[PDB]
Ligand binder design. Structure first.
Ligand SMILES: *S(=O)(=O)c1cccc(S(=O)(=O)N(Cc2ccncc2)c2ccc3cc[nH]c(=O)c3c2)c1
Length: 182
């Protein structure tokens, strides 16, 4: 009866990355791999071991990307893509940041975007003095059906009401100008 002793595999292997602003180093040299995991049990062991995003120093990021996709725009799977952006005010660091980030992680490892989960590359949380940000990165900013389905599902999974609109920008523009809004 394998259910007793086998870990539950995830559809993908995922890499969790950490960034801290150290002005002595280049941006790339500051982007650091925490660990990779590919089971439910190993995801929770990692998550239960690390700091909540709300406890990070301003200027730090977490990011979760599929194994083989670097957490930067210049990766082959990111360079033609873009992101759904959640912007948090300073009060939402207390109320929403950690629960929104956990839900984002689960949307990813749980493959919650049906046939379009293959367009997801990863997700990033930025802790910043002027307002935190959470974003889901996807591979192709011209795939309207993929991008808007991901945005509608994501908005629903976060519990955001229709009074809130979220935008999708291509990375080529980021490097707010929206391609899509939901
Ligand atoms: S926010 O904090 O104001 C902000 C502004 C600009 C970019 C970003 S970012 O795209 O989320 N970003 C941080 C990051 C951290 C860890 N993993 C991925 C992304 C970021 C910053 C600088 C970059 C330089 C070059 N290529 C990139 O893809 C970069 C991404 C947040």
């Amino acid at each position: 009866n394998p259910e007793h002793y086998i870990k539950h595999p995830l559809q993908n292997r995922w890499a969790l990355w950490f960034f801290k602003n150290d002005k002595s180093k280049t941006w790339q040299a500051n982007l650091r791999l925490i660990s990779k995991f590919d089971t439910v049990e190993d995801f929770w062991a990692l998550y239960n071991h690390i700091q909540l995003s709300s406890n990070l120093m301003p200027g730090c990021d977490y990011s979760l990307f599929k194994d083989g996709i670097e957490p930067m725009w210049e990766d082959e799977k990111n360079k033609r893509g873009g992101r759904w952006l959640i912007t948090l005010n300073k009060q939402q660091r207390r109320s929403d940041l950690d629960r929104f980030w956990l839900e984002t992680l689960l949307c990813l490892i749980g493959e919650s975007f049906d046939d379009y989960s293959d367009d997801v590359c990863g997700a990033v949380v930025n802790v910043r003095a002027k307002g935190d940000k959470i974003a889901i990165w996807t591979t192709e900013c011209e795939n309207r059906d993929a991008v808007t389905h991901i945005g509608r599902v994501y908005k629903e999974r976060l519990g955001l009401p229709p009074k809130i609109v979220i935008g999708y920008q291509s990375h080529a523009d980021t490097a707010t100008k929206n391609r899509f809004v939901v």
